[PDB]
Design an enzyme around this catalytic site. Structure first.
Site, PDB file in Angstrom:
ATOM      1  CG  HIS A 108      -2.596  -0.299   3.193  1.00 19.96           C
ATOM      2  ND1 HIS A 108      -1.349  -0.830   2.940  1.00 19.96           N
ATOM      3  CD2 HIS A 108      -2.498   0.335   4.387  1.00 19.96           C
ATOM      4  CE1 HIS A 108      -0.532  -0.527   3.932  1.00 19.96           C
ATOM      5  NE2 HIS A 108      -1.205   0.178   4.825  1.00 19.96           N
ATOM      6  CB  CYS A 156      -1.011  -4.203  -2.494  1.00 23.49           C
ATOM      7  SG  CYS A 156       0.694  -4.106  -1.925  1.00 23.49           S
TER       8      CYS A 156
END
Lengths: 168, 88, 88, 168
Positions: A108, A156
């Protein structure tokens, strides 16, 4: 054939090799000790499970092996553990008899960087790209002086969809 | 005798998306950027240098769908072409 | 009808040095990076795309002297080769 | 000959042009309106005078004109003025009938970014690279959608010499 060490990577023929002053030198296949590192965070304390990460690990590991690298895979690490692993990687004696390296980070991510396993909004656990470069530069990793260092990051970099509308 | 060397050289970073923006991951098929990169490496490592390959990956993302992202190369200090010369 | 487009695409940045580091400027001859870039553009715009040209500029800085710097390309979202096609 | 519009830029012949699916399209020479912007800070309130900046302005201006761009030159601006100039540049109608652009920034610089004319340690006057990209992206500059945007920055990015020692 995919049965060989290069698997599904298309081979560069000897005719193509001679066809290709401005290229990074490649070390002899018989004696070189190429190293690669994959850090993948799949299981987290506060953010959702990264389902399908195992597919990415398999693909990248096999690809880098196909290209001639010995691949270390480290999973589910804090930013601090990532730092420790990177420092350990930079100190590896094999880099001296290597001509290049690959670093792969999969987790992430937010705008600031890559999330460690313990990351939350209250207590951030982030590894910045700047830190990765610093740990692998000539000062901290002299064994990779003059050698290509390829850094790959799947994460991301914020919450935005990355799109805008237009009319034709 | 001692000599000077650049502190940062021969780096290339390739990120899955642009700043501020999401990167997509299929729950069974894996990360689209990772999958796309593998496919392009498998195909083009024989004939193209890494910068050329990464450019082709970026082109493959050009037409945006419901789940769009644009991979980006950053902090490039490659002074030469990096050919992988697969098989050698 | 409306269509989606990537918010950030077809960019290339070229900086005079790497993060943390100085860039040099001769008081009468000008900035070394700027001068070097002009020389390489003049010579190679006819035959090379901008990414290739910037790489050559980086190579020209490879051997460090008393006033060293390494130019770097950043945030590259060029999906195609940018040829200047000088004269056309 | 250097007497022509392309000056000292070596010409691409028609034979070389045909020799060169993955290239950015070039607009007709007769109708295209290519634009370029140079922002150069030479005179500062608190930091030393950037002697030789005029040489850089001359060289870059003539080069970009040689390559077919109409060059705006803006001098000695605060970060806020740079922002205003960039926003004005992004709104120019000529970009619609242009195939590309060049942006050149030349000033003192720190780690964070480019120094405006009023910059000091107490009161920072900095333009970040991130802001330049944002002002020129598809959202804020739709006229340059799908078109190469080349950003050139001459500036320090910190105080370090950028070197490390090694023994042969």
């Amino acid at each position: 054939t995919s049965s060989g060490s290069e698997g599904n990577v298309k081979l560069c023929s000897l005719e193509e090799a001679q066809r290709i002053a401005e290229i990074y030198p490649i070390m002899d296949k018989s004696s070189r000790t190429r190293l690669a590192l994959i850090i993948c965070n799949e299981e987290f304390d506060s953010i959702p499970r990264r389902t399908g990460a195992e597919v990415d690990i398999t693909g990248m590991t096999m690809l880098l092996q196909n290209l001639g690298y010995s691949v270390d895979v480290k999973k589910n690490l804090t930013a601090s553990d990532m730092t420790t692993e990177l420092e350990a990687f930079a100190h590896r004696p094999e880099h001296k008899t290597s001509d290049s390296t690959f670093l792969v980070f999969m987790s992430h991510g937010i705008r600031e960087g890559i999330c460690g396993k313990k990351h939350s909004e209250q207590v951030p656990d982030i590894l910045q790209l700047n830190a990765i470069f610093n740990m692998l530069n000539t000062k901290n990793c002299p064994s990779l002086k003059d050698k290509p260092k390829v850094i790959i990051i799947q994460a991301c970099r914020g919450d935005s969809p990355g799109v805008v509308w237009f009319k034709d | 005798a001692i000599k000077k060397a650049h502190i940062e050289k021969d780096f290339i970073a390739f990120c899955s998306s642009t700043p501020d923006n999401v990167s997509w991951r299929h729950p069974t098929m894996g990360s689209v950027f990772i999958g796309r990169l593998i496919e392009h490496m498998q195909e083009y490592a024989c004939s193209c240098d890494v910068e050329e390959i990464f450019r082709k990956v970026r082109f493959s993302f050009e037409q945006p769908d419901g789940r769009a992202q644009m991979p980006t190369t950053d902090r490039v200090t490659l002074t030469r072409c990096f050919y992988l010369f697969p098989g050698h």
